[PDB]
Design a protein around this ligand. Structure first.
Ligand SMILES: [Cl-]
Ligand SMILES: [F-]
Ligand SMILES: [K+]
Ligand SMILES: [K+]
Ligand SMILES: [K+]
Ligand SMILES: [K+]
Lengths: 238, 237
């Protein structure tokens, strides 16, 4: 399988962070790839092994590091024949450069993909993300380089965004939506021209309410999927 | 700790991709978990170059067996200790795969039939032309005392069309094709209807209220069976 999977430009999804976001990524690979039939869709191998330690607990509360888990499942995907690896978790990109160095497969960053899909006129941009993604500034250096100004929720509001994410991770979308939606309105009221959904649970909470939201919402999961499809479609046989 | 020690489940999917994503969705929804880390360890093969199953069985098209075998071994080598296949037609090859498999395998057919209420003796069957033609459900249904109701030829062409319309990405058109066939099976006396092709639950999704009889979800039945397998180990919760 390995050599023919590699010849076929198989994409590996390093997911499980969390599992609903990984399932959402798979749906988006189906929705965003033009295919005449089953056989024209993207070849995908998915790691949805969610025992990976909590990313914010590690970065902000001294919890066990997820790195060695990420490294192990990365190598599992490569050994299965993945030639490109994508990670449907923003906070995990704290370790992106580390994983890239040990990877033989190509890796595509969710951060670059997401920032690249912001309309050029949107210069003041809200950011919905986990505490650790904000605190370690994962989007900060890259946003500054593109001439963007990020707006994040205040301390009280950011606690509610974190609650929404973990309520989604617990399986209660309706509760998560009631928590998140006033924070989206607050970001707009403070002048967000666009809002980055910079945690891959956020698209799952917003889904069905984009019409009720004044400004565009940038879907980091979809941005990464689109980038991976462009990689897949750039080969001479594709 | 190796994936085999952790009782990792391998999903041999890509048949088709949307149905495989649906199975992942259902693994989340059907497993009681308080956080990311309590969910089922899963490795997924969604490599869809597997040749068309009905084309093989009914027209002599290229066989999917060598692809299924290859991706099976890929999943075992990655650490899957149990394998589930979210495709009913592919279970034509279930015994062959189980012969060469080191991991446990759980049939979508047995799981689905086990989730039929015992009072439903007359059961509609929505499936591909090849699943019907090769009788994948017939002997197991006969053992349980069930009578299968399948659409007549004209209706079945429309069921097959709905499945392939969903596989092309048009859920709205697939529903327009499928829903009259569901009413027909009910009008003919179905007491439950097996969604015996894993694209059927995606077409029906959001309309079970308007349907007068229970719809038996083969994908969900398989997920529930795999979760029970995972939860039965002494060192799992
Ligand atoms: Cl073959
Ligand atoms: F994320
Ligand atoms: K599509
Ligand atoms: K996430
Ligand atoms: K659940
Ligand atoms: K199927």
């Amino acid at each position: 399988y390995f050599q023919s999977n590699a010849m076929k430009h198989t994409i590996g999804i390093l997911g499980g962070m969390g599992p609903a976001a990984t399932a959402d990524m798979l749906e988006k690979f189906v929705e965003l790839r033009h295919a005449s039939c089953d056989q024209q869709h993207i070849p995908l191998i998915v790691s949805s092994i969610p025992d990976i330690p909590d990313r914010t607990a590690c970065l902000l509360s001294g919890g066990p590091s997820p790195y060695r888990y990420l490294e192990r499942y990365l190598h599992m995907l490569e050994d299965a024949g993945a030639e490109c690896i994508v990670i449907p978790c923003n906070t995990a990109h704290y370790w992106f450069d580390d994983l890239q160095n040990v990877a033989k497969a190509r890796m595509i960053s969710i951060l670059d993909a997401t920032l690249g899909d912001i309309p050029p006129s949107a210069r003041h941009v809200g950011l919905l993300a986990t505490n650790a993604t904000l605190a370690t500034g994962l989007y900060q250096k890259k946003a500054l380089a593109r001439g963007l100004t990020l707006i994040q929720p205040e301390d009280a509001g950011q606690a509610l965004v974190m609650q929404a994410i973990y309520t989604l991770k617990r399986g209660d979308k309706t509760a998560a939506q009631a928590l998140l939606l006033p924070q989206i309105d607050s970001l707009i009221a403070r002048g967000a021209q666009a809002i980055i959904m910079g945690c891959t649970e956020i698209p799952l909470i917003v889904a069905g309410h984009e019409r009720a939201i004044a400004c565009p919402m940038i879907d980091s999961t979809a941005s990464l999927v689109r980038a991976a499809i462009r990689w897949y479609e750039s080969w001479p046989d594709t």
